[PDB]
């Protein structure tokens, strides 16, 4: 009966709520990253036979969380350029790296594209080839990835994904043709959440493209969203009624809002005001706290599609100006 | 509640219902095509500023039904070969030509891609720029395009679309770099039904790619599909109960099954056995009557997405073999 | 899920959001009507062979927008009196004039009933016989009537409907048995939106019955209504992201709230507090701006059905009191 | 999700499933009717102060099942002819007699109209004014379909059908009604009631039976998981020991069994996409209907059936009949 | 579409809306209870052939509203003790007493359990064996919420609540039952009934009231558009002239008005995402409740509430209470 | 929407479809169980202070798949008898062992009840305490447990669950009050499928109670079930369109139909004819191949609840007659 709505826009634009994060947030990520950096990155780019004619495609492997071997694609447009800018692409929920030809946009716009495959997913809308590896026993969980290892940040699924994602930018920077002054991190929804994390943790990203981000402002999310991936957390709490405080404590280490406050690189965001998967309150919480130079494209009538192909042109224009 | 099912695969493969067409079907089409040929084609290819680097994008204009000026895109991949193969791409229901960057797949595979905008639509999932023109009065209709002018094949919406589509192949052929002998016609859903009509009506098409085709086997479509575009016809009939014979007479001139019976060019079909928008029994009816060399890729667990990216690979492989 | 709610009643009674119209609102309508008044009304009544026994039914034809010939029914109850009061009845979305026996209420209560057919609709719940005529090209649109010609008030569908509707009152006035001092204009939903326009624009209407009106407070309507006809507008904007400003500019010329502010005749309104098709805030916006003498029947537990048969009795008592 | 469908039309036309009734079917209805006939009909027609002008409206009270007083409307078109034909009108599920102006069709077409109000319902889409009277009111699923279902003697439709038979007798007592030109009419529940009356009353000259409910219960519960028929299923989901008894009871009220007994001319209608009153259930009754018959088939309509188009067909059917 | 939400917890904790009851609320309940006290209780505990081994099961019958015979179960755990505490269990909407094995929790915790069957229901999720007995059964919407709603004297929950008060007396009459530790319990409709009993019974020692239904009817119909509260709204949708009567009738059965008068210790529970019994309705009742009281709040649960976590909470609550 | 239906009862009673299994089905299970038997069972029963007064409750730990430590409850009713019969209870999808008081039925009927916790689940409707331990990498999967490790039977999740279940009987049997001639294995839905496997694989089970069983006749299940856990398989196949043969090859090793053919102990089955989660054709396929002495209770009008409390009485009666 009731159509979805959130704070009106004048309120979203001022929405800077009290952040929740433990005092050891930076230390958790420092130690996480240091432990994973002990295993050699060992990036492998295997040229592959392909029907593509305008783009050269590579099969990628590199070491992410605790040396575990993560797949990707590297798509190189055939241009007369000794160096090229690069977009590192992160993938939406239940997706995976698919085929090289699923990622033609950035190469077609003259960018090398590094597509990071997502550990353990790749079965919902686009196939994937990378397994997850638990940090110990695989605890009781609700179906999906949002509650996997949620009783402890050290065991949580996104600790491993975010580490992979940081390592992904280092791997892309190792490709000789990549212009290390123009490496972009990009993503929509889950991709956007991952990218926000990478924007805070990476030593190599120079700009962020963050669309309709997921993994932002969890306590407000579960209040508004009864479908889709945020509802996995609620469903877990319905059964583990004694685990509320622990669950939100775990999630605080992974929250896009806490990452946005640490991020320094320039960013383009987008938000759909009728998006009931990633509510605009959650998106604006992150955007407003984002500490680098930033703009946001606001799509008042769109749901989780956001700006779609209009936003893609905005991203191209944004980056051309940033890097000219 | 009950999962969508159609006839079993064993039966689908032999499904060949009794066709129905009026005596003047070919004359209706000859006459329509001859009248539109009286206006100069006047194909215009104006290079526009996409931001594409691997492709050059032309804003296309050409004369379709009764000299009405139709929009499109022509995407040329950056390769030297003086005569390149070409895919003429027709668009799904409620879509339009969008941006040039929405159609990068065929260009990236080495093919010039001619994307035809769909008159009067372009407002549902991808934007469009081409108006429709009625013959005269815009008769009472149900919301949508399926019942626009349905009381007479002469006034019927798809008369105009299908004529535009045939003319589109002539426009693609006029581009200097297009190889006249390697022009493919392609589409999914509405695009599939248009391509199927064109496969019978054009003398310039060399091969057909027809995915999960719409506009096929109307009588059975409406018995199975209570949502999406086929339901428009049913809803018109629920009110205009006196018009059953007239409505189905009109639709017989635009039925993919009837065009398939006349089509002689090599084709690759795809079908999803759980497709409840374009039921496998309507697709198989068209496919089993298709008079040219033919194969069909069957996706037994997919809905209207059909083969998705797997099917695109199958199309590339199919055309490479055919052109050797 | 969340059950439908809008502003509470104490807030609804006081709701007068800031109006938006262009500086040429009045001139647009003066020139519209003056252009159509150049064509003779030519009201034509023809007695129908009917099975009806308590009513004389006539087929109606009259000149509406730019002389286009609009169908109607005139139902005269077989009574003593020399002159009778008259109800001009406008029809809901996807309806049409149907059969004479579809409109028995008002004749049975002793009122001549003029039923205006709705151009180009008549295919959803009750048949119609009147075509629409576009100005020129039929622009890209979303399925339905809400976005037909929406990029320009001069081309917008409701320009033609509202003009038809003003001309309908003249047509009714030309039946000699009609008491011109007691011409009422009535409708529900789309009918109520049409009637609201006519209450501002007609010189012959003596009273308004406006039930659960549609075409009111468009900005708020699209926030609250994601099903049904208001969401046609939203779906159009989701795709045509560059046209927001233009779309709402056009709709301002047709919004009941703006007409209500100009209307002087006595009116009875009705509203359902749980109506999620025509939200009570949109109805109250128009009611509260209505500048003639006015009452409103409020139905707290009804959805879009409103007061139904109870409300029909209320209208009978209201008009009787008004005219005594 | 799979879209609703039933048997194809070529099979629906040939669908004559094996009937099931108890051996005391006719005895049950004879005793029921005789028992209720022992109380006086005592029809009361009270002219109302109405806003209507083309129609004289009467508040009706008459004795139905076991002397119980049942409301109604009598609507009389203001015409010359001294004796007028009459349509007895029965109402859809969760409806009631509503207002006089809700029933203008038949008077407008020159027929006196008797609207029988429906005991205990009158709260879903149109209001009613007549209560039910049960005995103990056994455990039931919400609604009217399982009210007293463990015994035909206590079953809710025993009382409705008896009211409906008596309604025809009440209509025939009105002076301006031509007692030899009375018709029985109904849609959905109304159609199921009228089909009972077609078998049980000797007074009606014809049956108008649209998208009839209360037909072929066994089949109806296989196909209908929402709406009134599902009440029966839900009752059986819980009372897993009462299957035989529930269906035994329903056989006394099944339109298929009444159809087999009915001799008067009939115009039926069916929607081939009706998921409320499925076409297999309607055709089962239509195919056993023993009198002269025809069915208007609406292949794309759901439960609305032929709507106004069917109303026209009814006017022409009765016009030819009463010439 | 959108996720369910009510007032945030901070506001819920001080939500005390202005109560509405008629001047004669207490008088209405005294007459009701006195009229029913003129019939003998006549509790019958017939020992059953049961497969149970840790529990002795009785088939119960007692006199509820106006001497009408209400069914029940009594479950006695086999323990070395002569006087045992008791839980009088009331049942959720469309349920009934089912089998004795459906109610093993309280006996397994050492309590005698008196399960009261719910008149005229027992057909939706668990079978029942007890009929309702109304007079005329007025037009109503399908279900129990609008049965006899035009007069508190005829309203269905007059008879259920009287039954429920009388059930406590029947439990107390069982010789093993320790009369100083009689607890009244239920969830949803059960909790609504138990809350009435907490005001009307002189025999109850403690209240267990989970996710209570029958609370704050005005706001309930504003938030709840499916399930039992929506029966009222649908009745009102059609009976547009009866809004005032309907809500006047309802004020006599509203747990908010009972809570205001209840004195015995209570444990409530609430689901903050409960769209069937919204937390605003539950807290209105909790906040007005005049006895010593605690509430378990489950922020992420819907109508299931605390489920098995809550059962634990209850056992501890009563252990600490009776020690 | 079509109400759920399957084959009529006359057909269900004779439904014995052609079985599919690999030639190494027995060898796979023998090797699986032999490897897990190398680890000490080490069944731990800890008296666990509950408020239960008619029942003694024990916290249970035992070695399941590859020595992994599985939780459970042991509920012993306080009776005088020195030996008691035992029901080993397995749990439905997304459940876990919960609290001891969630399982009072069988103890109340004088049976010791051994409730096995379900590895990695315990988060949907009843909480669990036991983690899963993967066979190395956790492959790309669809959310849930149905496709966890589905590309190889050695890695498939239900390999570990079934092994655990077999060992559970060994654990229950080890308890001194348990009469080893009266060890029953029982479950509904997922529990019923687990029990079915255990009836073929346990050498200590004396009787099977098998209600509305899941994990049966996977091919047919996915043709009929589009929501709930069977649809996890379908969604995985929608994306992994090259894995169809491998997926079903893997599932044949865990299919209740194949275990049923090998099970010798007396069984009581139950089935709901309108069960759209575990369709009656899938259940009858298992029952019709079941090789021990067997009966089935058929509930024509029930959905997934089956016989509910009615069936629980049938079970008690069945076991009483069985054990003399």
Curated annotation (Swiss-Prot), chains A, B, C, F:
Example of a GO biological process term: cellulose catabolic process
Effect of residue 106 to A: Minimal change in catalytic efficiency toward the acetate substrates
Binding annotation for paraoxon: 189
Gene Ontology cellular component terms for the protein in this record: cytoplasm
Signal sequence, start to end: none
SUPFAM superfamilies, per database record: alpha/beta-Hydrolases
Temperature dependence: Optimum temperature is 90 degrees Celsius. Activity drops sharply above 90 degrees Celsius. Stable up to 100-104 degrees Celsius.
Record's keyword annotation contains Hydrolase: yes
GO molecular function terms noted in the UniProt entry: acetylxylan esterase activity; calcium ion binding; carboxylic ester hydrolase activity; cephalosporin-C deacetylase activity
Phenotypic consequence of residue 93 to A: Reduction in catalytic efficiency towards fluoroscein diacetoxymethyl ether
Main location: cytoplasm
Residues bound to substrate: 93
pH dependence per the entry: Optimum pH is 6.5. Half-maximal activity between pH 5.0-7.5.
Annotated control of activity: Activity stimulated by up to 40% in the presence of divalent cations such as BaCl(2), CaCl(2), MgCl(2) and MnCl(2) at 3 mM concentration, but inhibited by 82-85% in the presence of CdCl(2) and ZnCl(2) at 3 mM concentration.
Outcome when changing residue 89 to A: Minimal change in catalytic efficiency toward acetate substrates
Alphabetical UniProt keywords: Calcium, Carbohydrate metabolism, Cellulose degradation, Cytoplasm, Hydrolase, Metal-binding, Polysaccharide degradation, Serine esterase
Subcellular location: Cytoplasm
Active site: 189 (nucleophile), 275 (charge relay system), 304 (charge relay system)
Pfam families for this protein: AXE1
Protein EC: 3.1.1.41, 3.1.1.72
PANTHER family, alphabetized: CEPHALOSPORIN-C DEACETYLASE (PTHR40111:SF1)
Function: Esterase that removes acetyl groups from a number of O-acetylated small substrates, such as acetylated xylose, short xylo-oligosaccharides and cephalosporin C. Has no activity towards polymeric acetylated xylan, 4-methylumbelliferyl acetate or alpha-naphthyl acetate. Able to catalyze rapid hydrolysis of a range of substrates preferably with acetate groups, independent of the alcohol moiety. Exhibits a narrow selectivity for short chain acyl esters (C2-C3).
Protein name: Cephalosporin-C deacetylase
Native organism: Thermotoga maritima (strain ATCC 43589 / DSM 3109 / JCM 10099 / NBRC 100826 / MSB8)
Phylogenetic classification of the source organism: Bacteria, Thermotogati, Thermotogota, Thermotogae, Thermotogales
């Amino acid at each position: 009966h009731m159509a979805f709505f959130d704070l009106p826009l004048e309120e979203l634009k001022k929405y800077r709520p009290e952040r929740y994060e433990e005092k050891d947030f930076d230390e958790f990520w420092e130690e996480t990253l240091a432990e994973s950096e002990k295993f050699p990155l060992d990036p492998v780019f295997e040229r592959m036979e392909s029907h593509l004619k305008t783009v050269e495609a590579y099969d990628v492997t590199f070491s992410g969380y605790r040396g575990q071997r993560i797949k990707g694609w590297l798509l190189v447009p055939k241009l007369e350029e000794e160096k090229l800018p690069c977009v590192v692409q992160y993938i939406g929920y239940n997706g995976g790296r698919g085929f090289p030809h699923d990622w033609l946009f950035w190469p077609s716009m003259g960018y090398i594209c590094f597509v990071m495959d997502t550990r353990g997913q790749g079965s919902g809308w686009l196939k994937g080839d990378t397994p997850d590896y638990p940090e110990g026993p695989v605890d009781p969980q609700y179906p999906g990835f949002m509650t996997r290892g949620i009783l402890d940040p050290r065991t949580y699924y996104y600790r491993r994904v975010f580490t992979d994602a940081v390592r992904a930018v280092e791997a892309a920077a190792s490709f000789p043709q990549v212009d290390q002054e123009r490496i972009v991190i990009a993503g929509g929804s889950q991709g956007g959440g991952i990218a926000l994390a990478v924007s805070a943790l990476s030593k190599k990203a120079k700009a962020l493209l963050c669309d309709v981000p997921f993994l932002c402002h969890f306590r407000r999310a579960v209040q508004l969203v009864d479908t889709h991936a945020y509802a996995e957390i609620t469903n877990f709490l319905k059964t583990h009624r004694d685990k509320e405080e622990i669950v939100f404590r775990t999630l605080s280490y992974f929250d896009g809002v806490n990452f946005a406050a640490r991020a320094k690189i320039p960013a383009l965001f987008s938000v759909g005001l009728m998006d009931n998967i990633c509510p605009p309150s959650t998106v604006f919480a992150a955007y407003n706290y984002y500490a680098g130079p930033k703009e946001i494209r606001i799509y008042p009538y769109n749901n989780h599609e956001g700006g779609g192909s209009f936003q893609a042109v905005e991203q191209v224009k944004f980056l051309k100006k940033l890097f000219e």
